[PDB]
Design an enzyme around this catalytic site. Structure first.
Site, PDB file in Angstrom:
ATOM      1  N   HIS A  92      -4.170  -1.367   1.709  1.00 25.08           N
ATOM      2  CA  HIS A  92      -3.780  -2.730   1.263  1.00 25.08           C
ATOM      3  C   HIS A  92      -2.293  -3.035   1.540  1.00 25.08           C
ATOM      4  CE1 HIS A  92      -3.028  -0.674  -2.772  1.00 25.08           C
ATOM      5  NE2 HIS A  92      -1.940  -1.464  -2.712  1.00 25.08           N
ATOM      6  N   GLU A 139      -9.363   3.643   1.759  1.00 22.63           N
ATOM      7  CA  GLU A 139      -8.058   3.116   1.237  1.00 22.63           C
ATOM      8  C   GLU A 139      -6.859   3.909   1.732  1.00 22.63           C
ATOM      9  OE1 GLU A 139      -8.066   0.090   0.334  1.00 22.63           O
ATOM     10  OE2 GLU A 139      -5.939  -0.104  -0.258  1.00 22.63           O
ATOM     11  N   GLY A 170       3.758  -1.413  -8.561  1.00 24.24           N
ATOM     12  CA  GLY A 170       4.937  -0.660  -8.102  1.00 24.24           C
ATOM     13  C   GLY A 170       4.645   0.826  -7.913  1.00 24.24           C
ATOM     14  N   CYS A 179       1.755   2.075  -6.347  1.00 22.32           N
ATOM     15  CA  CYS A 179       0.846   2.321  -5.198  1.00 22.32           C
ATOM     16  C   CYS A 179       1.609   3.094  -4.124  1.00 22.32           C
ATOM     17  CB  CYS A 179       0.163   1.054  -4.694  1.00 22.32           C
ATOM     18  SG  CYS A 179      -1.036   0.405  -5.900  1.00 22.32           S
TER      19      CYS A 179
END
Length: 182
Positions: free
Chosen positions: A41, A72, A146, A148
Site C-alpha cells: 500500500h 502485502e 505511522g 506500517c
C-alpha cells in the site's frame, strides 16, 4: 531493556532506512545487497526518497501467493551506492506462531520506537482495507498510523513487517527465506 530489544536494536541500527512515497513515510527493512521490503500500500513508483535522498527504483515486485492472493509485501531493488548487511539467515523458512515479539519503527514521527507486542498468532487470512490477504501474523497491541513497515522480530529471527490494525490488534505480513533466493 532485555535480549529481545537487543536483537531488535541490532536490526534497526544497520538494516533500516526511512522510505518516502506519495502515500507517506515508512520504516523500510533492507534484507541484502540493494534489496529492501515495504508494504504494498506504499505504492512504490519509479522514484522513492531513501533517508530524504532521491533514489531510482531498479525493480519493484508486489508479491502474491500461488492462489494469486495479495501478500502485502513489495520487494524493491534500490539504485543505492551501498549494500545492506545480509540478514537472510534470520528469516524463517516456514509459516509459524511466535512468543515474545518486538515491533520496531524508525520515522520522522516515531524515531527509535520499540513495542513489546507479546504472543504472535499465525492468523492466515485477513480482509485488509477491503483486500483479501494471506500469511498474516496478529498481535494484541493497539498499533496506530505511522507504524506500517515496522519490523517484527523475536530473538534471532526477523519474522514480518507491520501492514495494519483494527484499533485493538495489529497485523504483519510474514517474511519467508524463499522470498529472497537470488
Amino acid at each position: 531493556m532485555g535480549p529481545g530489544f537487543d536483537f531488535a536494536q541490532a536490526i534497526m541500527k544497520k538494516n533500516t532506512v526511512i522510505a518516502r512515497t506519495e502515500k507517506g513515510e515508512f520504516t523500510m527493512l533492507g534484507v541484502y545487497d540493494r534489496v529492501a521490503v515495504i508494504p504494498t500500500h506504499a505504492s512504490v513508483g519509479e522514484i522513492i526518497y531513501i533517508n530524504d535522498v532521491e533514489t531510482r527504483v531498479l525493480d519493484a515486485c508486489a508479491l502474491r501467493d500461488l492462489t494469486d492472493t495479495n501478500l502485502e509485501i513489495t520487494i524493491v531493488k534500490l539504485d543505492r551506492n551501498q549494500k545492506f548487511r545480509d540478514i537472510r539467515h534470520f528469516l524463517p523458512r516456514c509459516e509459524d506462531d511466535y512468543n515474545d515479539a518486538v515491533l520496531s519503527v524508525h520515522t520522522s514521527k516515531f524515531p527509535n520506537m520499540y513495542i513489546p507486542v507479546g504472543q504472535v498468532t499465525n492468523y492466515g487470512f485477513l480482509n485488509l482495507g477491503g483486500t483479501p490477504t494471506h500469511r498474516i501474523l496478529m498481535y494484541n497491541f493497539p498499533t496506530r498510523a505511522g507504524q506500517c513497515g515496522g519490523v517484527v522480530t523475536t530473538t534471532g529471527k526477523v519474522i514480518g513487517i507491520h501492514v495494519g490494525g483494527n484499533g485493538a490488534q495489529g497485523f504483519a505480513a510474514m517474511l519467508l527465506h524463499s522470498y529472497f533466493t537470488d
